[PDB]
Design a protein around this ligand. Structure first.
Ligand SMILES: [Ca+2]
Ligand SMILES: [Ca+2]
Lengths: 193, 21
């Protein structure tokens, strides 16, 4: 009962991430205002969830096949495109970019990217690397490539509009993000908090 | 039995909202 073995506990689940908020007209005045979400996809990036709670009890992890899932809380009469991707490089930051088309193009350039209307649902996969690398669970520290396996950027391509030509201006909620994940944690521990 | 005197043809086409891609 005192086994000193280190074994990967591959285990599945699903978790509620966040309610996304498309920006509208008032707040959306520049390009970086079109980045609705900047959410690391490290196991321990979602405090109240189950994945993060488990992560807290291990050193490491590796998404074997993760996926972000968008569920719309709006009707179809509203129309606005969204582009979502997961940069495997936690440091690559598009916030510095000024041109909107440049940002959407460097988004669509990523391999696991998707586009969709905020009235339907899709799935944003995570493309896992090839060098068997593991990542740490604790709160992000000196460097981020040790901890984060990816960073999910959610983008606003169009302007939020409704039944009529009316352009909404109140920055209202469009849907909800869900993570359908599978990862294996290696070394039992407790991470501080 | 003059065939095809005044023939007419009907063909529908659904018009849904928000055809998504
Ligand atoms: Ca990148
Ligand atoms: Ca740690």
């Amino acid at each position: 009962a005192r086994s000193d073995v280190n074994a990967i506990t591959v285990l599945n689940g699903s978790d509620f991430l966040t309610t996304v908020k498309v920006r509208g007209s008032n707040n959306l005045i520049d390009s970086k205002s079109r980045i609705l979400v900047k959410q690391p996809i490290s196991a321990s990036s979602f405090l109240g969830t189950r994945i993060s709670g488990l992560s807290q009890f291990w050193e490491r992890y590796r998404w074997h096949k993760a996926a972000v899932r968008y569920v719309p809380a709006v009707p179809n009469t509203l129309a606005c495109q969204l582009i979502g991707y997961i940069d495997t490089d936690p440091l690559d930051d598009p916030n510095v970019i000024l041109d909107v088309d440049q940002l959407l193009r460097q988004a669509t350039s990523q391999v696991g990217a998707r586009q969709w209307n905020f009235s339907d649902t899709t799935t944003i996969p995570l493309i896992v690397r090839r060098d068997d690398q593991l990542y740490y669970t604790g709160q992000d520290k000196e460097n981020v490539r040790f901890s984060q396996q990816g960073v999910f950027y959610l983008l606003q391509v169009t302007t939020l509009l409704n039944i009529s030509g009316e352009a909404i201006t109140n920055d209202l909620i469009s849907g909800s993000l869900y993570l359908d994940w599978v990862c294996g944690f290696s070394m039992p521990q407790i991470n501080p908090s | 039995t003059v065939p095809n005197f005044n023939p007419i043809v009907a063909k529908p086409t659904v018009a849904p909202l928000q055809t998504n891609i």
